[PDB]
DNA sequence: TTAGAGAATTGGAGAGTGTGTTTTTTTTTTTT
DNA sequence: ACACACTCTCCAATTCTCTAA
């Protein structure tokens, strides 16, 4: 430790607010590079430099005050570009070994400190001025390299994640990412991103600008971002008072129910009762030791602890939570997003698609391209501008491209067991983008223009005639798994299914019959494929969280369930004890008034069950087990 | 420059090799070069008197230490257990430079500070003061026998001091504290003495207090560094 | 030693399983139209009661998961063919 | 993962109250008072209950009805508010205290009905005990693997970790308190 | 189905028992107009008290069977009567709002057992006894519902608790990490309890013996209704408990300790203004009011007038109140006169100048016999502020 | 396509070990 | 003699893999 801490001091010293470099500072930073060139795989030199806080202590003063020496400026920039490179790229993965895990965490800690240190607007200002000078040349390879490393420096600074677990800030407060983003605006560096994105000859930089822009907007979804306006202050104030009111009210109500359930006399007042005629697990009647009031809602299991699960038996879970940034940041982001869509989207997408098609040996990350089209199409649609603003993406090639990518991800998720989690994440991203394409063609039907309506019919015609889009949903439902994907994937999949069936039904109405890739089609025959009992199990799992599901989610799932049960007459497939337990809890909750469709559907299907049970007593056995299609149909025959 | 406090607490800073060596050289040079208003060397006389009587204990005045080498005087009350260690190491080799045979009599020499300006009253101590050098006054009421303590063995003695009578308000009650005397400080006092005590304020856990109060509350004591009658 | 009890297929097809189930409901009564909620409460009450006969260790939801898994085995189908129709 | 929504709403609204409450004359009252906390000796900010009342009755009522559950979130609001304005050593911590409460209760009315609720009483002092330092948040060093554990918050008995985040350690007892980076507060009984 | 319930160790039906109590409420008119307790039910609906007294003699005169069952099995019968009352109270007046369920307090009018004659045969029966209060504890909080929170992921759960035992979770159901759930003391739900000590009264003792004592526990509403030295009649359940040999070990002694679980206890205007106005307007009222004092004393009228004037006093710098002195031989009626006037005024006090006196004239500080903490004892002169203080052997 | 048998890894049920635990004589100040 | 804290072991439950119904 002491060796580096002693030698690194050579760069200079600070006098009040004036920084004085040493006369061999350049040779000194060259020695720091020589240290890094012979660093250990644990990244020990980087941890030592971080402990010595060289970047915060000397490099920021050198860049702010001594940048007139362009060779020294170049040396400092490249040094900190190597130092700031994200930990996942340095180690190659999050390490399995505890020693390397500790080193990774420590390196990432120093990177977090560097990100906080970089928040000074003066650095971005100098960087933007330098970059503004470089682009005026219409240059040497070293000039291009300086542009490259400037872009990569801000990329690396943005890339290292914020520790929301450390910050624990309330909504509308600024995180480290938020403050740094605001500093980008305050420096004017954003204007250069829009120049680079809009200028045609800068296509080589546009691929980097895509990563920069997509890194900035991560915390804000485009729909709520499009929602913002100057009156939001009073809106949030009044709404928060209302939210606090209902929260307090709910706790009061629940308390009183518990208070009435408990007896009034103290916990040692005693007593004992025999439930005459109710036999035990043993040969004789049950003896009950608890208070008299408890028998009003008795179930024998109330005394039991839950079953202890094995470690490897646990399902997947979310590592993320919804947020909103400070109103200043929200307004700035909305302006930037509007200006990017206005000036840059189609040109940048054409450039990025060109690079992804041409430059396959370079292994560029396609997920950013899909993220950007998924984000900006949603923003454009939320603002309901003319479809011309997103013209480039409105073509069949996008559907085929994302289908082959999504099916590749699906096949890899199945085959490449060692990376199935990441393949599932990639597949989920692709599904999200595809849902936006469907929403876009649906929206232009309700436009006033016949030309775009005809274009919509052309796209939808190809999508429904070809096999892949109508087969894909069944392929995903067939291989959904609790370890493989969290429930968010299932929500997206079933909602996309409802939208696909809606547009399919509307398209089938155009002619006496639809012919498809070759066979005469039948909508009811296609829906019969979803009568697989595994699909119903997934639907029931999604239904357990109906109070936490969105209103749109609940509408979509209940609509599809009623259609499948009623019109296909497959009703007996829903006669299940797990479902009946959920129905019992549903009808017991006093909040049932909010869920009229669900309770009426539940009472309807239970009516069918009790009507059958009155005739046939075997239903009480069938209720324990899942049905094959033949059994579902045979139960009505008896 | 030694004053360049950056990225580190002072305790960590003086642990570093560079700062430790600068502090060591500065105190040694101060010992050899310090002069009185007459142009007399002060510490030549004082060291020679210490050696002639075999007393093995060196007293320094805070005021002229500050007047000549303020940076060390600035650190000293903030990290006493560090700077006092460095000071002991520096003084022994000056003694051996002047008197090369003195290692026959002793192998360690203790530096003791005096006239520290930041005096505090014995009831105004707070958690703000923990692990710093302080000065107080009071009268001794309890005093153990001198006992040997492990380290090798050295003398150890424990005392209890309370506010001087007539400095408490009329009709109310006095506060008190415990202090520890080590090596040549033992039998520097006896019961009923009024003394001036300079030391380090220090705290540690005690289960009896936690069980008596019900809250995780610690016990405290003073490590003596210089004792003198008023 | 370590004679841990657990609910396997042979226990599930024992008398306290499907046979007891077949006979528990022939004494019950149900109210039907506009009373489906109460009928469901009664049904679940008897079902929790029956399940506790078969294996008094698990909670009711955990027991249902075990039965849902264990229903796959051919051993219970050999008994199901008797419970359905007649022995 | 889990969050106490009622507490979070109180934190947000109390911060807005401190930053928006103008005086009878026009300046933000508690913004001016907050500047005294720069001094080393000062830790506690006094808030008037009637001033709190003028902002919204719902907030006033919630604070009184939910005090013990909500109290640590008010301290975080003040911490944030002061940190914005002027430079202070970041290890320092701040406290909120309320007065001008509209009502008073007798000693014999204090009963287990109102455990945790904001209350005001009066009486005559008979005896008063010494000052001591009390631990509020500990820092521990795990000796068998040389890893630090931070912000171990205390309750009535002294509590500590027994197994560390570093999995190869297999320790149970060898932990050392950092009495230099732990933080304490003054405590007194009467 | 509630009709199937029968009390353990016996053969009494719960539902039938509840019905019989409701018939009693709907029928019992006062034997000396709707039923008597129906009047109180209508009143308590608007008054807002949480409890209903019932006299056992009315139950007995209505039905011998129900009375026998009550005395035999109070632990199971009394909660049933609670339920019966609350059903009627909410079947009627359904729009009335009340914070708690009504408690029923059966009470027996007069002592049935001497506290020297309680026997092992009485355990868990409803009994009534009488005596003199000696000491009252400080108020004790008592747990009702424990609140557990996960250290790892902040998930929370509540545990209803079982005759003093808490069912501590082994694992957090959300995050599947063992031994991670912690009890949060000040978020749990508590109740009030108090311990009272009582002694047999001096009249019913055997000659020359010392008196016996018992321990009473009082919960919720009743928790502060008596003070030392006064006398009461109490009805309760006679409980018995084992005790442990040492705080660490789990062995118990073979001889049990008994206490009373208290259920009920009893201690043993313009018209006036117009009368006072007319009386004050009558002549020689000063003589009449003076004459009213101490009828045992036949002639000392002007002394009575002076005492009357002291009781009336001046009004409010300068001392507005009056001080009087009585002198002469011992054995004269002056001490009786002091004791008479002492009993006429609310803020009065009485003591002697002798050192044997019960309360001193001087304030002092002493250690509490219970906590051994200091307490400030003010003297009779301070306590009688804005009042009269009588002093004997001055 | 659905289900059972043979081999490998891992949790925890259970046992063993170490340790802790009112009642008398003499002085001092101030009340008499 | 009767309770905590700690260390350690062997039995068999859960999943991978190959095979038949
Ligand atoms: Zn460790
Ligand atoms: Zn948890």
Q: Give the largest interface pair and sizes.
A: A-E, 31 and 37 residues
Number of helices of chain A: 30
Instruction: Work out the helicity level of chain A.
Output: 55-70%
What is the helix fraction of residues of chain B, given as a range?
25-40%
Task: Give the neighbour order of strands across the main sheet of chain A.
Answer: 1-2
Listed once per kind, the bound small molecules are: zinc ion
- Main β-sheet of chain A: number of strands, strand sense, barrel status? 2 strands, antiparallel
Rounded to the nearest angstrom, the distance between the terminal CA atoms of chain A is 82 Å
Number of strands of chain A: 6
The multimeric state of the shown protein is part of a larger assembly
What's the SSE blueprint?
The structure is cut from a larger assembly and holds chains A (638 residues), B (230 residues), C (87 residues), D (190 residues) and E (394 residues).
Chain A: H1 2-7, E1 12-15, E2 18-21, H2 25-37, H3 44-52, H4 54-65, H5 70-84, H6 87-91, H7 98-117, H8 121-135, H9 141-159, H10 164-167, H11 176-187, H12 189-198, H13 203-216, H14 222-227, H15 232-261, E3 273-279, E4 285-288, H16 327-343, H17 345-358, H18 366-383, H19 396-415, H20 420-445, H21 450-465, H22 467-478, H23 487-508, E5 515-516, E6 519-520, H24 523-528, H25 533-543, H26 551-567, H27 577-588, H28 596-615, H29 619-622, H30 629-637
Antiparallel strand pairs in A: 1-2, 3-4, 5-6
Helix pairs in contact in A: 2-5, 3-7, 4-5, 5-9, 8-11, 9-13, 12-16, 13-17, 17-18, 18-20, 19-20, 20-21, 20-23, 22-23, 23-26
Chain B: H1 10-15, H2 17-33, H3 42-52, E1 57-61, H4 62-75, H5 80-98, E2 110-114, E3 133-143, E4 147-150, E5 153-162, E6 176-182, E7 194-204, H6 207-213, E8 219-229
Parallel strand pairs in B: 1-2, 6-8
Antiparallel strand pairs in B: 3-5, 3-7, 4-5, 5-6, 7-8
Chain C: H1 9-12, H2 18-24, H3 36-54, H4 60-70, H5 74-83
Bound molecules: zinc ion (ZN) (2 copies).
Chain C binds a DNA duplex (32 and 21 nucleotides) through residues 1-2, 4, 6, 72-74.
Short description:
The structure is cut from a larger assembly and holds chains A (638 residues), B (230 residues), C (87 residues), D (190 residues) and E (394 residues). Chain A is mainly alpha-helical.
Explain what you see.
The structure is cut from a larger assembly and holds chains A (638 residues), B (230 residues), C (87 residues), D (190 residues) and E (394 residues). Chain A is mostly helical and 638 residues long. In chain A, 65% of the residues lie in helices and 4% in strands. In chain A, the strands form three sheets. In chain A, strands 1-2 form a two-stranded antiparallel ribbon. Chain B has 230 residues and is an alpha+beta fold. In chain B, a hairpin with a 2-residue loop joins strand 4 and strand 5 (153-162). Chain B is globular. Chain D has a domain at 5-97: mini-chromosome maintenance (MCM) complex, chain A, domain 1 (2-Layer Sandwich). Chain D has helices at 5-20, 29-34, 49-55, 57-85, and strands at 44-48, 95-99, 132-142, 147-153, 175-177, 183-187. In chain D, the strands form two sheets. In chain D, strands 3, 4, 5 and 6 form a four-stranded antiparallel beta sheet that branches. The chains are: A mainly alpha (638), B alpha+beta (230), C mainly alpha (87), D alpha+beta (190), E alpha+beta (394). Strand 3 (273-279) of chain A pairs antiparallel with strand 1 (5-7) of chain E, so a sheet runs across the interface. Residues 150, 152-153, 155, 172, 174-175, 177, 180 of chain E line the site of one zinc ion. The structure holds a DNA duplex (32 and 21 nucleotides). It is classed as replication. Keywords: human, replication, priming, polymerase. The entry is titled "Human replisome bound by Pol Alpha". Chain A: Protein timeless homolog.
